[model samples]
Target chain A: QVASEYLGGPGGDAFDDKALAQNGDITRIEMQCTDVATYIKLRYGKVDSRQWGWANENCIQWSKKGVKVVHELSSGEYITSAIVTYGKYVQSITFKTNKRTLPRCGTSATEKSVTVLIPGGLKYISGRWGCRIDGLRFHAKC
Target chain B: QVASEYLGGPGGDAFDDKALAQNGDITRIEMQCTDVATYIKLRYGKVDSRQWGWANENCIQWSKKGVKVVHELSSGEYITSAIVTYGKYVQSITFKTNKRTLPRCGTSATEKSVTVLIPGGLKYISGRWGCRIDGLRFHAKC
Candidate 1:
């Protein structure tokens, strides 16, 4: 409303995108865009609030190596990707979300690592000490 | 800068909660609330640029018979959360995320329930098809 007021007339043509908050005070906003979301916003009864959409700054990433991620985290283009690591042996990184779909080309590389691209969530490695991709910051263990 | 100016002259104190993204555009905001998150938000920049702080008004209820969400859900929680009017059937729900610590109180009550009071995230269920407290949303199946 204000956008048009500050610019055009009875608020006709300038911006034509649309949205609706069906229930409750908008908790989550899913952005479905054609090319890419450049700008996004939210509107109260007045419609002054706006939120943009893009690659979240703090999302899951490899960035560099084991220091931040796991050791030699390997990924297969379509098959299996694994890492053997220092074999600092503990137990196993068990899947906490999707155990069945856990990516495997055959027998896990050596039974300690998982592919980052695996399509699941929350995995666990017994915490006598220390883990990523998905889950609470705790689960990722960084 | 903006939030402050909106408060008073050369403002800063009047709006401590106000913030801006000096580095990059705000992306996602994860709220660290207890057990079940009552709130969440996103930002255009700094973590301080935070927009909201409590239970999302639109999040589905912890409402149900018995189910416990420890960390997250797969893409399906969304699809199932979708209403089909007449839902389908199911034999069992397999955990595709993590296999260990899949929460079981001596063999699950009738193989279908958990108490919301269990002190964790609780997801939604659909008879024919499916939703959580948090974690990239990954329990699996819709």
Candidate 2:
């Protein structure tokens, strides 16, 4: 039940969780947002035999759109962040970069990425626009 | 129990929870935070019922210091923030001031502050480097 103002269209999201609670059961959850761009909302109130439902688990993940070449950082800078849901909670998170400083004209390239999935009560992760990562086809810089 | 980073000093805190989960007894809990300046760590393991001398009634709270006249939207402009706690799952939050464009004296001194306790989810209130309530305080203008 993940919803967003920007995610009005299908495939508009970078990452999405199937369901927050199993079988529509709202259970106590342990969540981890490995990447720093995903956030979740847990609803607490009377819903079932005290059992929560779809209303509690809404996983929303986001990555910087527009594949910057933004005003602040250099061109070709990109980043992507995703989240994972498991065992009554969100258990996976990843953030990475596949970018270059300036135009290298097909020079040998290098890529880097980072993931966090130990065990913590991390509910959300949000980072400002700095470097970038897309983990896909490469874009050249100026 | 609630944990923090700005909580470096012994008790530079405003409203200490005395201990999260009642009487220093760590137990199941819920939490909420307003500004992104503070953080906490909740323990979900077992520690037995004996040592938990605290009346597991479930409750908590904390804050950030440094009454600074920060420089941003204006020069010599001041700003500040604080925290309050309540309830079984209620945590602390914050409010602040905006940099000014026009000034009359050492600060024209808007001379304004209000306490908002409207029978709701808000347990305690906080804020920034203005009048310094409780160091009590104010709501800002853009």
Candidate 3:
């Protein structure tokens, strides 16, 4: 499978959730942010798994200063596009799916922004993060 | 990009559609079928392109015994899963998207079937064709 080009500032250790994606579609996303993103957590597959499903939680959290935000996809809803604002760090991000758009997190007022659209739809996400989210990218399904 | 495993009969010459998907999202699909899929055509990107959009047509027309079936995706709609019934040839196929389900093409009475659910979603299609569509597979986006 191919991944989308990386986008975001050059900071923090990189993390990839591609393996978790193979288990199933993304079920939820959590982020902590203010003017910029500070942390992120992704939950893949079903919550009602009969086995050790909690092992699917992937988090890139460092600082705990920002408020946490969560978005749970409805059944069959998948992320198709993501708009990210960044400079030295990721400032804001918004997700769009086949059903509807979710609320934006962080601020994009004066930062550079980029849009990632996966023709097949968004399967998962990958990026670099530390004290703050420095970089981000998309992993479309294949 | 990687593609799903191929299914259906071993007859017919091979045909790949990995290039057409690079243009954009699939806007429409046309298939002719009865008990099994016989012919297929795909249209990608916006229909109202400013340039030579007519060059985007890709078809595999051979037999014309079945009725023509067309499925136009609504704006923001994308294929998520495909259920294929096949044995010696592709007997039937049904599509599922994020928004709604489209009508199935062909008949699945008693043939063996396979389900393809791309983690990201379906980007395009590929297959082998001759007097009838002998094989089929999916090409997902990166």
Candidate 4:
């Protein structure tokens, strides 16, 4: 499976995380966002993954007004698409899976948006990160 | 096998190149360097990999005074280590394999150097890139 190039403006440390085993399924997703995406976390199988961005005062403070999304998949459901909006930072994102469409998180005002659709299956996500979600990519089984 | 984090200064596009197959042995490595490493090309199996840096006037001009190295591995041999000297750019590198040791192919005038040794086998290399090599990582089977 080839991965899509990282999307969005740059401003963080490079990260190429993956869960590529026979049981490497994405079972959970959690995110916090406001004007920009502040934090993202992905779960592989049954374990919690690393947080991609800092969950400092901003993520905490913004949570009151921003969107916080957490979607857990059932046994055989899979993610099929991810729509991302971005500028210097990831602005917003929406995920569509076999089960349901998770609501978009974060703002999209004046930002560029792109969608990565992989009907077969999305294995994992990879990108750069720092105080905020800086870049994003969809890893698909080709 | 999990990969080591990318090491070196930041200044380019993020890249996650890999030659991950049963036959993904590195058979050739070519590099051009002077005060800073200007280009790097790796061959997996039997095909030429992508050129990581721009082959513009600078890489050509520096070639006169810089070092241009090409190493070809014989069958049944394997790379065991990579010694990298880097700062904002990769300044120098040396490769050691089961069969032979390739000479250092760049400079080390005033940069930080680190060695990545994988006695098991150095499967492939990945990093960031622009006009010159930016960051580097050594991938090994655990």
Model 4, B9: alpha-carbon shift in Å? 50
- The stretch of ten residues in a row with the least summed lDDT in candidate 4 chain B is B57-66
- A99, model 3: CA deviation in Å? 35
TM-score evaluated only on chain B, model 4:
0.83
- For residues A39-69, could you state the per-residue lDDT of candidate 4 as single tens digits? 7888778767678876465645433335567
TM-score of chain B in each prediction: 0.19, 0.18, 0.82, 0.83
Fraction of true A-B contacts recovered by candidate 2: 0.00
Clashes of each: 32, 17, 1, 0
Native-contact recovery for every candidate?
0.00, 0.00, 0.14, 0.00
Off by over 4 Å in 2: A1-12, A18-120, A123-142, B11-15, B18-142
| Of 2 and 3, the candidate ranking higher by DockQ | 3
Task: Give a tens-digit lDDT track for model 2, residues B1-142.
Answer: 1111121122222433332223322232222222211232222223221111111223222233211222122222222222323222222333222232211111212222111211101112122111111121111111
- In terms of lDDT, the poorest run of 10 residues in model 1 chain A is A1-10
lDDT of 1 by residue, A1-142 (tens): 1010011112111222223322212222122122111222333222322322222434224221111111111222111111211123211122112112222211223432322211121111111110111111111111
True lDDT of residue A105, candidate 3:
77
Each model's TM-score? Answer: 0.20, 0.19, 0.48, 0.46
Q: Give the alpha carbon lDDT tens digit for every residue of B1-142 in model 3.
A: 4355587877777777677677778777778767666667777775321111111223324333567787888777777667788888777788877777877887654787655554455677777776666888876665
Number of the predicted model whose DockQ against the real structure is largest = 3
Per-residue lDDT of candidate 3, residues A16-94 (tens digit): 7777777788888787656656677777885321111112223324333557787888878877767677777677887
Top candidate, metric lDDT: 4
Query: What's the lDDT for all of these models?
Result: 0.21, 0.21, 0.66, 0.68
RMSD, candidate 3, Å = 16.5
Question: Against the hidden true structure, what lDDT does model 1 obtain?
Answer: 0.21
